[PDB]
Amino acid sequence: NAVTYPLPTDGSRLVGQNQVITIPDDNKQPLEYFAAKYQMGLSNMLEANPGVDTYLPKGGSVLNIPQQLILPDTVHEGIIINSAEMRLYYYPKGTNTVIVLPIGIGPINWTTKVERKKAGPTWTPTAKMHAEYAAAGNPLPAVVPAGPDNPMGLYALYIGRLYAIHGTNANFGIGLRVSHGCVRLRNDDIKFLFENVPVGTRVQFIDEPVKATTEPDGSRYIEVHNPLSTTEAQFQGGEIVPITLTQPVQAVTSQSDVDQNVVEQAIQNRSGMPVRLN
Secondary structure (H helix, E strand, O other): OOOEEEOOOOOOOEEOOOEEEEOOOOOOOOHHHHHHHOOOOHHHHHHHOOOOOOOOOOOOOEEEEOOOEEOOOOOOOEEEEEHHHOEEEEEOOOOOEEEEEEOEEOOOOEEEEOOEEEEOOOEOOOHHHHHHHHHHOOOOOOOEOOOOOOOOOOEEEEEEOOEEEEOOOOOOOOOOEOOOOOEEOOHHHHHHHHHHOOOOOEEEEEOOOEEEEEOOOOOEEEEEOOOOOOOHHHHHOOOOOOOOOOHHHHHHHOOOOOOHHHHHHHHHHOOOOOEEOO
16 A cells, blocks of 8 residues: 555654656546556645646646655554544554554544544534534434435544544545534545554644654755645745744754755645655
8 A cells, every 4th residue: 555654663754655647638537546556645636736736637747656765753552533634643552663544634632531432423422513504494304314425434433532433425525624523534545544453542743844764874855835724825826835844843954964945846846745854
């Protein structure tokens, strides 16, 4: 599996390899189709592919698949969710691997755990949402039954304070900020988590749009994504969205052998793909 990585045991955090594919000349598929095929988020695909058309990637163009990544600076235990890059990292007890799955969101810094998990979850809408639907004339049960029309999809992991990691019955959404729901995954991905994550697993939410590492061979890398709150205009350069380097990131990026032109280009581009600094 391209998104299951053996974990390095020497302190390395750079894992994986990028791919590049060619879009057929006769292509009719939107970007979401490629993102799903490669288990990527839509925003990650946009970041890695400047000017790509989400409606219809240009036939005969090339598409970068950003499967190389730096592991976030956290414990290598349980589930880590980094909303700024729309990724969920799972460090299973049963293996020495990390599985990296794309998510959609609708929590920034919080440590919790999986309290329970359910095949075929029921959805209990908010009193708010019901008020809105009822005025619109839309029927909304107090309890939406499990099944194919349930917006949590076919599996859920509950994590406390109301929240869940769940599926979706929609055709898009993973790698996007939406309204409603907590963390959503594509069908096969949520099923995989449901089958493999025990109740009691640690869950930690972080917000780290920039990651950097000094690896054991002395090489240094940065990876820059758009910050969580980024709008279309900030994305495309009609507005700016500011990125500040945290001190852990500076521990790498301020080193004496770093090419600061690579840092500045990385910060401007926000490509989502690791770039070597030295």
